A paper describes a structure:
Utilizing nanodisc reconstitution in lipid bilayers, we successfully captured the IICGlc transporter in two functionally relevant conformational states: (i) a symmetric dimer structure with both protomers in the inward-facing state (IF-IF), and (ii) an asymmetric dimer structure with one protomer in the inward-facing and the other in the outward-facing state (IF-OF). IF protomers of both, symmetric and asymmetric structures are comparable (r.m.s.d. of 0.59 Å). In the IF conformation, the position of the substrate binding site relative to the membrane plane faces the cytosolic side, whereas in the OF conformation, it faces the periplasmic side. In both conformations, OH-2, OH-3, and OH-4 form each multiple hydrogen bonds with neighboring amino acids, including E202, R203, K257, T297, and E298. A major difference between the IF and OF states is observed for the glucose OH-1 binding, which is coordinated by the F337 carbonyl oxygen in OF and by the N215 side chain in IF. The ring oxygen atom is weakly coordinated by H211 in the IF state. Considering the size of glucose (~4.7 Å for O-1···O-3 distance) and the narrowest pore diameters of ~3.6 Å, the glucose-bound states obtained by cryo-EM likely represent the substrate-bound outward-facing, occluded (OFoccluded-holo) and substrate-bound inward-facing, occluded (IFoccluded-holo) states. In the IFoccluded-holo state, these involve M17, H211, H212, E298, and crucially, F146’ from the CL of the opposite protomer. Consistent with the physiological role of IICGlc, the glucose in the IF state, awaiting phosphorylation by IIBGlc displayed enhanced stability, remaining bound throughout the simulation in two replicates.
In [name], the glucose-specific transporter IICBGlc serves as the major glucose transporter and functions as a component of the phosphoenolpyruvate-dependent phosphotransferase system. The IICGlc-domain is the membrane-embedded glucose transporter domain, and IIBGlc is the soluble cytoplasmic protein domain responsible for phosphorylating glucose. Protomers can be divided into an N-terminal (TM1-5) and a C-terminal (TM6-8) functional domain, representing the central scaffold domains (SD) and the peripheral transport domains (TD) in the dimer, respectively. In summary, the structural elements and the observed conformational states exhibit typical hallmarks of an elevator-type transporter, suggesting that IICGlc utilizes this mechanism for substrate translocation.
Residue numbers in the entry:
A (entry chain A), B (entry chain B): 4 to 386
């Protein structure tokens, strides 16, 4: 059941992403320094959003623990304990292993685990909960027995894992740093084209959350004037990173093409199966256009027309290079929709080109889908 | 149902306490600087325990949220978000309200909420979960609907509450600071005598957790060489505070008298109801002697012999002044037992007097219970 196990990783890694909108509303608006809001309000909102982003590794740990424990809050408490213990164990052991000052390591994040550390801590907590949450102790130790024993063993395992990972990290950490530097600053064009293609390829099976975690949460490192450091395209754009927003190509298809593809599916639908198909597809198009959720649109032609899905994946992969080359920069919280498009427009660049290239993308999607449905006789909804 | 509501507060405030043993094992041993352990091991364990104690307000928020949401992990995630948002909102607004530098406020903790802030955040998260965890949104916004909407509204409410409390705190905070200073440094004798008496009076109904939260977690302020600041007798003793350990009077009755009271109950039991009574009471005595859990012993004579319970409460209240005056200093993690007595003995003082005064307390309890059962015909277990 490896395939199902991988899915639970995707769902568990999605939950930390679902709480980004509150960070986007606060940090996105606050960092924009809108003239129609007092500076105090913007500063407070920015600080609140930065607080939300400072706990992202802990939120990931909680997500993993809840995903692998049927959403039990004691597992979340164990994840908190284990994440704290592991982070402090690594921070105190790594200077000894590397024989370098702790301050330099912290500043350069040589031993920093971040989201991966949160995932490891949450996995430890989930395993300890699943094994020991029914542990029977001697009658005179019955108090610590059960869910009460989970945090203690989780913390012990956490300190052990902290020592082990303080020994193990340097190589994998250097590899991760090199990959992040490449994909963020050296060749972001091909990097994010591949990201888009692989994400569309993985969306059918739920692994796109796993594939997104690096690009959305880890690659890149931006520090604001307050000294807080952000990792990933999403937090870095919300924080106000001029180099972020490389995921802006999501808008081009999510808000224009997939809705245009749905419109094409509606039009190509038979008249006897046209009204209901149009209702379903307009609902899906509105969903993808406002929130950015593509699954109602993509699942319609995911299996019946694999050729259409491959063409969509290629176009989506090309969307990100198009925006990067054209300078179109606008970020999202969870998925690329109109709400995120407007709320997060404060730090955007060339926001006017988005409707233009979007109309182009809609025309391309509509024409391609209509032509290939007529030619290849693809059985899109309503057939 | 106010009485039941108060109970849920006690249970919810107990859960943060139940994860103290891992802090006690690590911080208690690590801070002791035992010669039979390498300095590196002790330092690592101390840092891990300090990490556990740094998140105590967050652990309290999670406890409240889980207690008032039937232990749902999404409520814990909402509590994390809300606690972070509220803490940074207060830290950024209070300097404006008080017109004082933020650094001075943070150092002196003038606007610090701590455990109370965690409780407030957890209450916000629990209320928002209970109200909105079934919220129905427009079909095109269905993604944010449900448990996904709880963290966003919880964070908004958290920032609003942060502003309100940054306005409201100074008076109540000054009152709390004065009470803590008094009970910790000015008249700890009467303070902890009253604490013991009221704790024994509230144990029957579960409010003793609420009554303990201030003394255990808030009164006092100790900072170690690492710069971490601890609040409450328990963390301060674990950290190595010479002035802490005022709860050491718990041992005198929990490990000696209540077990001695159980032995007296066994002896006074009728021969036909003596073997099983002795088994039950020896199990209870072992529980209270090792872990410190008094409920098995106290509930035996709680209702049948209210006079005995009142005498026990008075003796327990006198226990803490006795230790304070005699200098007997030894701390606990959750309750006063032999495991905590040994593990946390590294920072103890006059550990030799504990068995002596304990034998005295056992003699007193045994004599009093036997005499009053023979005289007043109190129907202790086995009658
Ligand atoms: O699965 C929900 C959403 O997750 C986002 O990260 C993806 O970009 C979208 O394509 C998807 O609809
Ligand atoms: O209720 C469990 C335990 O809680 C502790 O805080 C009290 O000191 C004990 O008397 C009690 O047995």
């Amino acid at each position: 059941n490896a395939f199902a196990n991988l899915q639970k990783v995707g769902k568990s890694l999605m939950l930390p992403v679902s709480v980004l909108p509150i960070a986007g509303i606060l940090l996105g608006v606050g960092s924009a320094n809108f003239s129609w809001l007092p500076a105090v309000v913007s500063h407070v909102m920015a600080e609140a959003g930065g607080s939300v982003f400072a706990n992202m590794p802990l939120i990931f740990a909680i997500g993993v623990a809840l995903g692998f424990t049927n959403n039990d809050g004691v597992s979340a408490l164990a994840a908190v304990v284990a994440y704290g213990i592991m982070v402090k164990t690594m921070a105190v052991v790594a200077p000894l292993v590397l024989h370098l000052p702790a301050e330099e390591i912290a500043s350069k994040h040589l031993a920093d685990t971040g989201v991966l550390g949160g995932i490891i801590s949450g996995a430890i907590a989930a395993y300890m909960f699943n094994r020991f949450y029914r542990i029977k102790l001697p009658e005179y130790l019955g108090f610590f027995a059960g869910k009460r024993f989970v945090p203690i063993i989780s913390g012990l395992a956490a300190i052990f894992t902290g020592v082990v990972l303080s020994f193990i990290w340097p190589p994998i950490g250097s590899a991760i740093q090199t990959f992040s530097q490449w994909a963020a600053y050296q060749n972001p064009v091909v990097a994010f084209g591949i990201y888009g293609f692989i994400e569309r390829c993985l969306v059918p099976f739920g692994l796109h959350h796993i594939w997104n975690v690096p690009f959305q949460m880890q690659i890149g490192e931006y520090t604001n004037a307050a000294g807080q450091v952000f990792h990933g395209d999403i937090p870095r754009y919300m924080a106000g990173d001029p180099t972020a927003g490389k995921l802006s190509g999501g808008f081009l298809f999510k808000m224009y093409g997939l809705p245009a593809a749905a419109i094409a599916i509606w039009h190509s639908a038979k008249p006897e199966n046209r009204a209901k198909v149009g209702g379903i597809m307009i609902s899906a198009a509105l969903t993808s256009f406002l929130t950015g959720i593509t699954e109602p649109i993509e699942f319609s032609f995911m299996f019946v027309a694999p050729i259409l899905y491959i063409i969509h994946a290629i176009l989506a992969g090309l969307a990100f290079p198009i925006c990067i080359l054209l300078g179109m920069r606008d970020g999202t919280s969870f998925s690329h929709g109109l709400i995120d498009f407007i709320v997060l427009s404060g730090n955007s660049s060339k926001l006017w080109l988005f409707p233009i290239v979007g109309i182009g993308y809609a025309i391309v999607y509509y024409t391609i889908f209509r032509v290939l449905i007529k030619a290849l006789d693809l059985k899109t909804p309503g057939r």
